Amino acid sequence: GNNVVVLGTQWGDEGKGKIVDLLTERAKYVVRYQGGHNAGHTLVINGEKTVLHLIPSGILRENVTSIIGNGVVLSPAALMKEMKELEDRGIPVRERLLLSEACPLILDYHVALDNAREKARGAKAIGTTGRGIGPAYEDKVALRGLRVGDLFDKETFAEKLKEVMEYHNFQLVNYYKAEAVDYQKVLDDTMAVADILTSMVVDVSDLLDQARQRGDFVMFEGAQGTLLDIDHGTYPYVTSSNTTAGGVATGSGLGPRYVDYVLGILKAYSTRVGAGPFPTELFDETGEFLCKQGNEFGATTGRRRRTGWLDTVAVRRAVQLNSLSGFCLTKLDVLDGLKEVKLCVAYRMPDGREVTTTPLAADDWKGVEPIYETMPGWSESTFGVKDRSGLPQAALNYIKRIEELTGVPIDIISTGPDRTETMILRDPFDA
Ligand SMILES: Nc1nc2c(ncn2[C@@H]2O[C@H](COP(=O)(O)OP(=O)(O)O)[C@@H](O)[C@H]2O)c(=O)[nH]1
Ligand SMILES: O=P(O)(O)OC[C@H]1O[C@@H](n2cnc3c(OP(=O)(O)O)ncnc32)[C@H](O)[C@@H]1O
Ligand SMILES: O=CN(O)CC(=O)O
Ligand SMILES: [Mg+2]
């Protein structure tokens, strides 16, 4: 298909950045449609590592035009910082990056609010990434957020900014008993890069429409993971945007009917960072093994990721919500050596009922128990392997079982962090 979507089928950190960087060899555009710099997408080319946050993953390819869609909450500070680091490494970001005027702006006070709220929650904190993602999303819907377009008239901007900030500072000092964020500073800081941002504005939705009518290959790059979805995830332990496929259309402006292929990045074992339900979570040796071997640490916050077995019940919620066309099994190599490996095929509800469907809000996952099928592991090394033939039978079996339980084919398989340690059985762009 011409328009392919790459998203997280679990709780993020499945390996979107790599897969996007890999497949954008043929793409004209790469589009981020939701999230902000809470994302940490790691690319590894010939050993050289790049972890992107707000900047799309096609940025390392000069043939591709990277676009930040209206769904993304954009931090001018974050953007500039990332932009500088990439430029110093020879990537001419401004020549390859374009953005929407409809993107809400993430400014200093958003981070304060986030911190304030996170503290207020005490023991029942979300475990947010410390940026002002949710607050930025609130303002937007609240009809008071600033957008990139606003930066086009600086006096008007100042007016709008003083208001919203008076509003925010009031609740920050009086209600939260936290320190106020200075207006003049935010204005000065923001006005310093206004022009650079502004220079990259394009009418994203009209562009994608044009790209489409020409048959250009477009890739949409997801952020976070399905179970982190504001509507469908483990509310309130979620991120404030739609991480499910529906966000491509809302967050980019492309008509829903133009999504040709939805690729689901599936990790091979599960990780979760932040508070929230995690049925298959492991606190024993293997959990630890999974964390070490998989170097499972937040590509953004650096905190250790919770690990557990692959949850087929949870993944199947993902298959239907995102109308998955296919899977990309990642981190297979991380299982090398395990005597046996298991996967959750059902949930035991606190009232004795056996179920193969997931609860929705967090509270409803409370005493849920996983029911596993158990498979033999493999001692052979699958790292870097790029041909099914090099995979041991247990592995091939494990793969097949996943396809059986889900009813979705694994079209791509990743055996390592480098762009090339991968096998593409079926290319989304040809499907
Ligand atoms: N061994 C191994 N590491 C991988 C593979 N795919 C990606 N990685 C690494 O696993 C992590 C994926 O996490 P992250 O970058 O946060 O995922 P993302 O946020 O979806 O892009 C990063 O360290 C990648 O470099 C794979 O097949 N095998
Ligand atoms: O308000 P937020 O700052 O977004 O945090 C809310 C919650 O969502 C989690 N979280 C946010 N972005 C995440 C991510 O991005 P990528 O997969 O794109 O690399 N991967 C994994 N977990 C992620 C946070 O830990 C917390 O549970
Ligand atoms: O890659 C990004 N995530 O893991 C978010 C975090 O670091 O918590
Ligand atoms: Mg990540």
Curated annotation (Swiss-Prot):
HAMAP family: Adenylosucc_synth (MF_00011). The active site is at D13 (proton acceptor), H41 (proton donor). This is Adenylosuccinate synthetase. It catalyses: IMP + L-aspartate + GTP = N(6)-(1,2-dicarboxyethyl)-AMP + GDP + phosphate + 2 H(+). Homodimer. It comes from Escherichia coli (strain K12). Plays an important role in the de novo pathway of purine nucleotide biosynthesis. Catalyzes the first committed step in the biosynthesis of AMP from IMP. It holds the Pfam family Adenylsucc_synt.
